[PDB]
Amino acid sequence: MRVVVIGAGVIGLSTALCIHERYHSVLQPLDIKVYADRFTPLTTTDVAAGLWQPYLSDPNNPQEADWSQQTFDYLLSHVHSPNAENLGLFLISGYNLFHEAIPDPSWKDTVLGFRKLTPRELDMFPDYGYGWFHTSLILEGKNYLQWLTERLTERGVKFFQRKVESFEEVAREGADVIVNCTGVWAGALQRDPLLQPGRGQIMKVDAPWMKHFILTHDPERGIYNSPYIIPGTQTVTLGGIFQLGNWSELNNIQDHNTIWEGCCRLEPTLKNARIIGERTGFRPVRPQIRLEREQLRTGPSNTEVIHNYGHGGYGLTIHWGCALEAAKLFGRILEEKKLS
């Protein structure tokens, strides 16, 4: 059983690890290989701040709400483990500001100590008059991806830097199961009109006095098109750009100005914070995560393919639930091959 996972993002690496950990003993000819065009720190996961928060609206597939929750419970179960520093995982509390009262989220009980903001807290933010306060977790992509890489290397999963042109080229080379974790670039292997790039731009700033995240929201401009401030381990992430259909992997000046003055008005202590870096990424936007199987008509034989892409701006938030679910789909392929 030769398995080829395409993608070295949080989706591909966690899926490869979760498949190996659940199926190493039931299948000894289990050679897992990871094909990827870019690795850390050159993936979309590296650009993400790493905060655990799903979208405010319910996810159009209630199974995604569970995948988000079991990812949170799994990460929280190791947030006080001594290796949490290596994963880039830690607790963080913060605010979610609004201009008008909105209903509570579906993940209010997943989060620790969810509550609505008191008047004295709202007075620190004059432009907003309603919001939440809650304790969540941050999984920084740079540390988490390298942690997954080393653990996959411990389990004998070889890595190869190459751009896959088609599923058939991997199938014809001997692959039995192809795990499609290509993210926003998935359409290049199979056209999907529902998948489109949600381009974002973030600023990484040195402001170590920031102990809380601050996410603002405006339904007119869309989600994450509003200033947000997310403190990480060594730096503070400033963002607020979300552009559909923009393929320009290049830092914009106007977006830089939008991010800066939006967060500076939100928190005036940032005016003296030095800018360390700035990055551009593409959220794999889709109305639904494509986590499903597909038997490919490739050749006289037929290839088995597992898709998992289209996680939008919540990939790290939902990655572990998607990895477990992709491992279950891998097990059904096993039972149908007279193999489990």
Ligand X SMILES: O=C(O)c1csc(Cl)c1
Binding-site residue set for FAD: 8-11, 37-38, 43-45, 49-51, 163-164, 182, 283, 312-313, 315-317
Binding pattern for the stretch 191-210 against ligand X, x by CB under 6 A and - elsewhere: ---------x----------
Q: Is 276 in the site for a second copy (CB under 8 A)?
A: no
Q: Is 268 in the site for a second copy (CB under 8 A)?
A: yes
CA distance 183 to 60: 19
Shortest Cβ 304–ligand X spacing (Å): 32
Phi, psi of 35 (to 5 degrees): -100, 125
Interface pick for ligand FAD out of 31, 37, 168, 292 (rule CB under 6 A): 37
Q: Is 211 in the site for a second copy (CB under 8 A)?
A: yes
| Rama region for 183: left / alpha / beta (φ>0; ψ in -120 to 50; rest) | left
Shortest Cβ 192–a second copy spacing (Å): 37
Q: Is 234 in the site for a second copy (CB under 8 A)?
A: yes
Tokens at residue 299, please? Answer: 């050749």
- Among ligand X, ligand FAD, a second copy, none, residue 256 binds (CB under 5-8 Å by kind): none
Binding pattern for the stretch 166-205 against a second copy, x by CB under 8 A and - elsewhere: ----------------------------------------
Shortest Cβ 122–ligand X spacing (Å): 21
Shortest Cβ 207–a second copy spacing (Å): 8
Q: Is the dihedral of CA 48, 329, 72, 122 positive or negative?
A: positive
Shortest Cβ 187–ligand FAD spacing (Å): 10
Contact between 11 and 43 (Cβ < 8 Å): no
Q: Is 224 in the site for ligand X (CB under 6 A)?
A: yes
CA distance 229 to 213: 5
Contact between 337 and 31 (Cβ < 8 Å): no
Binding pattern for the stretch 29-48 against a second copy, x by CB under 8 A and - elsewhere: --------------------
Q: Would you say 100 or 121 has its CB closer to a second copy?
A: 121
Contact between 56 and 116 (Cβ < 8 Å): no
- Among ligand X, ligand FAD, a second copy, none, residue 311 binds (CB under 5-8 Å by kind): ligand FAD
Give the count of residues interacting with ligand X (CB under 6 A): 11
- Beta-sheet pairing, 177-180 with 89-98: unpaired
- Among ligand X, ligand FAD, a second copy, none, residue 169 binds (CB under 5-8 Å by kind): none
Footprint of ligand FAD on 83-122 (CB under 6 A) = none
CA distance 43 to 23: 27
Contact between 17 and 148 (Cβ < 8 Å): yes
Interface pick for ligand FAD out of 313, 321, 323, 330 (rule CB under 6 A): 313
The H helix count followed by the E strand count for the chain is: 9, 15
Shortest Cβ 90–a second copy spacing (Å): 4
> Taking the CB of residue 160, how many other CB atoms lie within 10 A of it?
10
CA distance 202 to 205: 10
Q: Which residue type sits at 98? A: F
Helix (H, G, I), strand (E, B) or coil at 259: helix
Q: Is 232 in the site for ligand FAD (CB under 6 A)?
A: no
Q: Is the dihedral of CA 205, 206, 207, 208 positive or negative?
A: positive
Q: Would you say 11 or 49 has its CB closer to ligand X?
A: 49
